[PDB]
Amino acid sequence: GAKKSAIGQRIVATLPYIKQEVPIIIVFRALGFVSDRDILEHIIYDFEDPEMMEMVKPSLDEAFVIQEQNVALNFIGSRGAKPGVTKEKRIKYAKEVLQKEMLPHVGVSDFCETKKAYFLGYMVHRLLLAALGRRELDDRDHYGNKR
Amino acid sequence: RKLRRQMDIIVSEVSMIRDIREREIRIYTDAGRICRPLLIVEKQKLLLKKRHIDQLKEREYNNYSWQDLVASGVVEYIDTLEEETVMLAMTPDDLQEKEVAYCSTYTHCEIHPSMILGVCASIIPFPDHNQSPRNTYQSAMGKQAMG
Amino acid sequence: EDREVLRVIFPTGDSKVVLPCNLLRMIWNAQKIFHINPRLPSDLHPIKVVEGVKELSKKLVIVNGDDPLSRQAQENATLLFNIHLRSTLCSRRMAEEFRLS
Amino acid sequence: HTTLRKVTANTAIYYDPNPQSTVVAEDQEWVNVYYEMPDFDVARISPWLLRVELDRKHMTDRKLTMEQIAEKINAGFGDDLNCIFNDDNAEKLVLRIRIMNSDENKMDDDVFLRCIESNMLTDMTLQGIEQISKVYMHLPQTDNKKKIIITEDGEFKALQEWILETDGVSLMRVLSEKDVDPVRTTSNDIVEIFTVLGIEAVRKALERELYHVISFDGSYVNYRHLALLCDTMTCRGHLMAIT
Amino acid sequence: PGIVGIRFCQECNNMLYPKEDKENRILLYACRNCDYQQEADNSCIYVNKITHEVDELTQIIADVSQDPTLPRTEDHPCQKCGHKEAVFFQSHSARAEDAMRLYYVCTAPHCGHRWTE
Amino acid sequence: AKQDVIEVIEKAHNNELEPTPGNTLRQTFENQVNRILNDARDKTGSSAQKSLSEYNNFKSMVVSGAKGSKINISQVIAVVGQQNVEGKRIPFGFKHRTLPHFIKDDYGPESRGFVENSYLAGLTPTEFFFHAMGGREGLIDTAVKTAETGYIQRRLIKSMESVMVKYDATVRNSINQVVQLRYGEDGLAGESVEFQNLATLK
Amino acid sequence: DDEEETYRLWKIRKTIMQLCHDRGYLVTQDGLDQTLEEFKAQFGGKPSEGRPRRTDLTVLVAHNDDPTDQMFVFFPEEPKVGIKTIKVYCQRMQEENITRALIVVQQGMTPSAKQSLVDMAPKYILEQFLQQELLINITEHELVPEHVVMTKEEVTELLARYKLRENQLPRIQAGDPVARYFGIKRGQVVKIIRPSETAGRYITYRLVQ
Numbered sequence A: 001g002a003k004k005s006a007i008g009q010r011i012v013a014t015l016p017y018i019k020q021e022v023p024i025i026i027v028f029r030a031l032g033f034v035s036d037r038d039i040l041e042h043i044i045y046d047f048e049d050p051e052m053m054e055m056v057k058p059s060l061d062e063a064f065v066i067q068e069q070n071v072a073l074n075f076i077g078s079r080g081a082k083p084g085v086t087k088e089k090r091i092k093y094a095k096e097v098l099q100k101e102m103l104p105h106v107g108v109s110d111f112c113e114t115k116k117a118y119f120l121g122y123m124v125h126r127l128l129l130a131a132l133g134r135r136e137l138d139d140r141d142h143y144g145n146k147r
Numbered sequence B: 001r002k003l004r005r006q007m008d009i010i011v012s013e014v015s016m017i018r019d020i021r022e023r024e025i026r027i028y029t030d031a032g033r034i035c036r037p038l039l040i041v042e043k044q045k046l047l048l049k050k051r052h053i054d055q056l057k058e059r060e061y062n063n064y065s066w067q068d069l070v071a072s073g074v075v076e077y078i079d080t081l082e083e084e085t086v087m088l089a090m091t092p093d094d095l096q097e098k099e100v101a102y103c104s105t106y107t108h109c110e111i112h113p114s115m116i117l118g119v120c121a122s123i124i125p126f127p128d129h130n131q132s133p134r135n136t137y138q139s140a141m142g143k144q145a146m147g
Numbered sequence C: 001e002d003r004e005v006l007r008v009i010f011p012t013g014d015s016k017v018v019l020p021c022n023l024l025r026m027i028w029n030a031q032k033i034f035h036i037n038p039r040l041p042s043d044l045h046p047i048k049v050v051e052g053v054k055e056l057s058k059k060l061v062i063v064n065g066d067d068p069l070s071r072q073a074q075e076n077a078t079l080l081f082n083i084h085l086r087s088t089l090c091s092r093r094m095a096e097e098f099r100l101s
Numbered sequence D: 001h002t003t004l005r006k007v008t009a010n011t012a013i014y015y016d017p018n019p020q021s022t023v024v025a026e027d028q029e030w031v032n033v034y035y036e037m038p039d040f041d042v043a044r045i046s047p048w049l050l051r052v053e054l055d056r057k058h059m060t061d062r063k064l065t066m067e068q069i070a071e072k073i074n075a076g077f078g079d080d081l082n083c084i085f086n087d088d089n090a091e092k093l094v095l096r097i098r099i100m101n102s103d104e105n106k107m108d109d110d111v112f113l114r115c116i117e118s119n120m121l122t123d124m125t126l127q128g129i130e131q132i133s134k135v136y137m138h139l140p141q142t143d144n145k146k147k148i149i150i151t152e153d154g155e156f157k158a159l160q161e162w163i164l165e166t167d168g169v170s171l172m173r174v175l176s177e178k179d180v181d182p183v184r185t186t187s188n189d190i191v192e193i194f195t196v197l198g199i200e201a202v203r204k205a206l207e208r209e210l211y212h213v214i215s216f217d218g219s220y221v222n223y224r225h226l227a228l229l230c231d232t233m234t235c236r237g238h239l240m241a242i243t
Numbered sequence E: 001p002g003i004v005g006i007r008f009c010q011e012c013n014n015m016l017y018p019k020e021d022k023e024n025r026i027l028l029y030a031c032r033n034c035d036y037q038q039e040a041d042n043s044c045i046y047v048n049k050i051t052h053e054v055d056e057l058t059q060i061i062a063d064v065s066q067d068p069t070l071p072r073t074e075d076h077p078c079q080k081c082g083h084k085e086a087v088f089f090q091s092h093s094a095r096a097e098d099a100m101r102l103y104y105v106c107t108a109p110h111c112g113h114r115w116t117e
Numbered sequence F: 001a002k003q004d005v006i007e008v009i010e011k012a013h014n015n016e017l018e019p020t021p022g023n024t025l026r027q028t029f030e031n032q033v034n035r036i037l038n039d040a041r042d043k044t045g046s047s048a049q050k051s052l053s054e055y056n057n058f059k060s061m062v063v064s065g066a067k068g069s070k071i072n073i074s075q076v077i078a079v080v081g082q083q084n085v086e087g088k089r090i091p092f093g094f095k096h097r098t099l100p101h102f103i104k105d106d107y108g109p110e111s112r113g114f115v116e117n118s119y120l121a122g123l124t125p126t127e128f129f130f131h132a133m134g135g136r137e138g139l140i141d142t143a144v145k146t147a148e149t150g151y152i153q154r155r156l157i158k159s160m161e162s163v164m165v166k167y168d169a170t171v172r173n174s175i176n177q178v179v180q181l182r183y184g185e186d187g188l189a190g191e192s193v194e195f196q197n198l199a200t201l202k
Numbered sequence G: 001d002d003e004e005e006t007y008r009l010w011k012i013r014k015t016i017m018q019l020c021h022d023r024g025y026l027v028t029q030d031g032l033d034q035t036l037e038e039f040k041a042q043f044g045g046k047p048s049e050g051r052p053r054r055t056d057l058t059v060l061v062a063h064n065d066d067p068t069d070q071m072f073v074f075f076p077e078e079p080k081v082g083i084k085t086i087k088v089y090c091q092r093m094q095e096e097n098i099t100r101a102l103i104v105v106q107q108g109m110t111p112s113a114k115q116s117l118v119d120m121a122p123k124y125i126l127e128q129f130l131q132q133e134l135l136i137n138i139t140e141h142e143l144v145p146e147h148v149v150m151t152k153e154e155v156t157e158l159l160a161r162y163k164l165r166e167n168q169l170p171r172i173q174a175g176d177p178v179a180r181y182f183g184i185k186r187g188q189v190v191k192i193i194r195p196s197e198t199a200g201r202y203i204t205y206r207l208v209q
């Protein structure tokens, strides 16, 4: 297509208790990082490597239209299990999603929005290494992955 | 590693993994991991000396047993995904100088190679002399034997 | 004419075919039952080898009919067998190799 | 099938205000050579430059000519695109590209110019036939693939000749091309034999495939039983799956 | 040519975007959320390496010299300090094209020199 | 053999190995090592089959085809040879090494699964494990293929079940529609035919 | 280039002259075998800016039994054809009194034209051939057995011998590349003569439905 060809590869997260996919940079702004320098500071630990930089760039242009935290939570809450009648019912709903059902092993309570920021940026960081090919795809049967 | 071999702060069950190329370090206290004991090798010598074996030989009425062997740092439990960072020696034979050095770094020695076999495959005499499906069939027919 | 048909039906010249009766065995069986001496000259007339296969090939009937559509459809069904059966029973091979009485 | 990405070393988009600027060191030589007598620039020259590199290895491997690529790019996209290239003398083989001159006479430019690249690298189709991934060349040692001719003595003489074997199939265009043998060319895929050569060719090409999987092991199943299965399938007039 | 890289605005710290000055014909970068503009020094924008001949000596970490599981030879001495131990390994990289080339990492503390033969 | 594999391995470290056309350098290396090791186990097999006396009982069961094949004698006396998983030499389950004992990036014959011991002298510990990995692929196939070959056997029957040779000798399915004018095109039952040479051809 | 497009116009013309010969239309032996240079002499090399314009390539061949029947092979110059273009051709067939004719399309027919061909069954029949489907004669492939279209006299005598109804034969659908080649219409029966490795020859009959 005309858009698919120009953009390149876009990254998306599929969250628990959300009907369909959500773009990634929307998920970082939902966690309280407004600027793209802070968002890309959690995902890419060294800015002198442009190869990663070019990988993320098309995922900023898809999230370019929502620049604000409370706009972003509303972007998520629209897709929840049921759409909230009132807006602030959705923002209250999406924030309860990021607090509890989002990566609960990091933390469940309040200021964990920072603790969830690095590690969630680390999923997005390690998904790049397998896209660039600097690491091996994990093995489904490797018996160290089993409990 | 030194605190686990003295069992001070860290139970022998906790596994710890230094992955160099990706720069991570991982410490898993989680339940369900599967780990088997190995002898430890410092420099080219086993940490199992003769004085340890003389005390175990007399184990009756010494109140001296496996736990007192593990607590001396001679044996170590190593689960799977920590076997990726280890060099094992089949027997103490591989530790001696062969004049052509395959590896000089062996960090753990296995107790005996034939402990890789389960309970029903441990009854077969000379299992290494048989075609491989024939140790699998005996595993099936060893459970059906009248006794 | 049959050697030109075979090279059309069998390119790559694979000569191994599957046919109803074994000719080389039965020619070989009729040497032993009748005690034929191959060192000796044969008594078998070279015409009665020819007139006997022609009269044989009419008595092998896959398709029964008098129609020009039935005739043409037998000559095709027995084609590769009559070709084989005229190779081994040839009037020369009977005089030289087999020496049938 | 050779896409332009097969022969491409690297790609960069540059911003040139005027061609004689040549922010690159080397291009300035032959850039001026073409602009000593510049043609079809009458409208204006778009500033946004697309400069691609072509590995001489893959270029000489497929016997590709810079003039040949220049034609296919200019022909594929038309006059909306201008293309300029080196002589083989250049140790670094370069192909310059710019937006339409008369376009100066939405989509922006740098965006629209990157949209051209990601369309070219995949879609150019310099050579060959799309859907043909690879083609292997070897001399067959099996008497089935060996051309076997009746000599003047009537003997069978098995000849060794080079045969090609493709990964992926489009049968109708492969047959049509020159020097390719119309008669003996065949594919293993049935449906593309059905749509091209008919239902009779499927009746035969199916019993040639079934006889290959059955007799590959060395096993032997009679020809009568192969021919009935291929008769039951194709006797309705079209391919009848067993489903 | 260069593999280029990002630039960030100095006010809202967003991604600057390249754009063309039509009057002066000078490449600019402009954040889209403010009026901040900056002149392009590099003059290259989007660069893509398809042949992607990649230098692994940049990715290799000097800490690799501490792994027991890697082989080492005293055949190849260190190029810098002339140390005999060198711990060598292959690409260890997916999408490496075809490379069995060994990369060498010098042992002994803090040298970390990394060469290829 | 294991010395000719070390040269092929050393040639590839220095890049001196040139790829065969149509083959990745990994594909040309995995071929040259299989060309050597197969000749090894093909030579030691035929060197073991020359040594068997006329009174040998293996040779008695093999020569008459009663049971066993010439390749079972090779593995008993001589060498068991390469062990394969999914048609490829043993893969890397750990990171860049096959078992904890081997060093990362060992492509040598021992690390990748070649067993140089015969069932009689007995397999060494690791060769026992790789030999177990190559045998699991045999057990799995036998469990999987039977359920596919039985679902195909049922489909071929239900589609053809009613086709029959009518008294016209025309083969006709259940509707009277004509599958063939004569059965098998020659009209002959398949049990009484034999192989023959034409002898006019060629 | 124009050497390829001159070579393509050499196959298409040659392969069609084999259709007309195999359907039983009178075709001179010289027109069947043309060396490219002899073809390049008659129709003159490069089509583009050249004497062959893709028109005047038209072929008029008369049937063997009836000199009146004939047929046309039309080459449209357009990449795609449309009802306004065919209506030009049909107006020409009306002009010269024939019925049957062929159309060789470069790329494809507009979906509105395909039905327009069917729109006239009795008066005029027209057949769509893609420019590729004629680039090779599929009759000469090894997989395709010799096909022979059968007269009505022979189909009656056939179905009486085996005592068959028409619908008990195998079928070959009218959309089959070897049905188009021989210009076969629903209800005709074709005779497949193919060599076999058991019988040595075998004759299959396909109905066309």
Ligand SMILES: [Zn+2]
Pocket (backbone or CB within 6 Å): E009, E010, E011, E012, E013, E014, E031, E032, E033, E034, E036
């Ligand atoms: Zn800004």
Ligand SMILES: [Zn+2]
Pocket (backbone or CB within 6 Å): E078, E079, E080, E081, E082, E083, E106, E107, E108, E111, E112, E113
């Ligand atoms: Zn050093």
